[PDB]
Design a protein around this ligand. Structure first.
Ligand SMILES: NC(=O)c1ccc[n+]([C@@H]2O[C@H](CO)[C@@H](O)[C@H]2O)c1
Ligand SMILES: NC(=O)c1ccc[n+]([C@@H]2O[C@H](CO)[C@@H](O)[C@H]2O)c1
Ligand SMILES: *[C@H]1O[C@H](CO)[C@@H](O)[C@H]1O
Ligand SMILES: *[C@H]1O[C@H](CO)[C@@H](O)[C@H]1O
Lengths: 249, 250
């Protein structure tokens, strides 16, 4: 288009339509309980959320048709959130398969590690650049997608909700994250009794109780205000922790 | 009441209201995903289905308020049906904890092994007798309850559905059962590809292939007409079958 401006963020992932379609087919193959899904309809609703729209004015309503088609009931008491440490959370649920991260749902599975955006009044995907959340605009197709689906995922949790936190970083709990700014504030006190944090140890620091870290105390204060209880555990040896989850015999 | 007639079936189970309430509280305690349920409302809706009503004119609509409150999503590809061998089916799911029978749902859990009925125009439970489906009337509170919940359970299944059958009896498959007259006819062909039967052997079956039994062939014909595939397997050693599910390491 002769009106299309340059953005600071990377362009849409190459082969984005074909990648989403292939993922949808693969997911329904792996999960027989979701085989009612029509993957053509899913992609059509996904594309309809952002195609032909300015990629700085996307709203939660734009994704509502996709949200409906992707409706999925995950056992509300088996939900695992994560902050910065997505790799270990997914390895965990690959072993503890009755536990689920957002990326283990259909919608999270489709979009995991992809970027996308379009342009106003055109049917073309923008493969050259997409808005950066800081330098360009906050209401872009990718950021709006994850804050919408993340909020819905947290709203469905019940009983005890677990979150993995990255203990190798200066902000073990970071307000400037999906967990800190979306998930923690949309757990429903009527349904969730406790938020249990798993602080994953790593980095080049000598072993110490990281549940005493100031940002964890910050996290405890935040969730307590919402009338939800807080629990914290250190995962000192992640490799050994996974080994115990796999073969606790 | 001065109008109440005698029925041929046993009366309502003793302590029925207390038993349903206790079971509802116990179930939601064990299953956190169902704690949105208000057990008082569940009992009230259960009670409202048959109290003050003639126990020969109960309908599926009478139980709809209970059905709505009892809504529960079980993984549709992990459903286990059974015919006459209820004990082993429950022993199986207690070990294979990702599979569910109807009695592993809240609604099935409440009513398992219980009998109940009321009377028209009165608020009293009939602890003296209840209608027998054969000698008195088929549309009684118990029979109507189970045909309703069993149909919805069967309607929810998807992919591969399993049914345990009692191979120690003459009619391994019996049309005159909840499975044979309700469940098999309400599996949705759009969602279910296969019905897999597990024929449980009894006391020394000479290792005979019971999947060739005439009643099994009858089952295969019935389900095939509905455009669903059929698979059959013999469970020769029920006790050993459970231990292998307990300890697959061997
Ligand atoms: N699983 C994901 O890719 C994921 C989960 C939550 C938030 N995000 C955001 O989307 C972008 C594109 O992947 C990421 O950089 C996050 O900002 C992604
Ligand atoms: N779980 C049960 O007890 C069950 C399951 C299906 C049908 N029924 C009927 O209810 C009566 C009272 O328990 C039984 O005799 C069956 O007819 C019971
Ligand atoms: C917060 O938790 C989710 C994993 O369940 C992750 O995608 C982020 O949104
Ligand atoms: C048929 O299957 C059910 C077990 O899932 C049993 O209750 C009968 O209705």
């Amino acid at each position: 288009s002769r009106w299309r401006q340059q953005w600071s963020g990377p362009g849409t992932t190459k082969r984005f339509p074909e990648t989403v379609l292939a993922r949808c087919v693969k997911y329904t193959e792996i999960h027989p309980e979701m085989r009612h899904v029509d993957c053509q309809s899913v992609w059509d609703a996904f594309k309809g959320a952002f195609i032909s729209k300015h990629p700085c004015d996307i709203t939660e309503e734009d994704y509502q048709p996709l949200m409906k088609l992707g409706t999925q009931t995950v056992p509300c008491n088996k939900i695992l959130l994560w902050s910065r440490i997505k790799d270990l959370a997914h390895q965990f649920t690959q072993v503890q398969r009755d536990m689920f991260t957002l990326e283990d749902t259909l919608l999270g599975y489709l979009a995991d590690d992809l970027t996308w955006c379009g342009e106003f009044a055109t049917s073309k995907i923008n493969y050259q650049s997409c808005p950066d959340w800081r330098k360009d605009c906050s209401n872009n197709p990718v950021s709006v997608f994850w804050k919408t689906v993340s909020r819905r995922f947290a709203e469905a949790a019940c009983d005890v909700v677990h979150v993995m936190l990255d203990g190798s970083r200066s902000k073990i709990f970071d307000k400037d994250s999906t967990f800190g700014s979306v998930e923690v504030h949309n757990l429903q006190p009527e349904k969730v009794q406790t938020l249990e944090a798993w602080v994953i140890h790593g980095g080049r620091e000598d072993s110490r109780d990281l549940c005493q870290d100031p940002t964890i105390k910050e996290l405890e204060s935040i969730i307590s205000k919402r009338n939800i209880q807080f629990s914290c555990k250190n995962i000192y040896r992640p490799d050994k922790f996974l080994q115990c989850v796999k073969n606790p015999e």
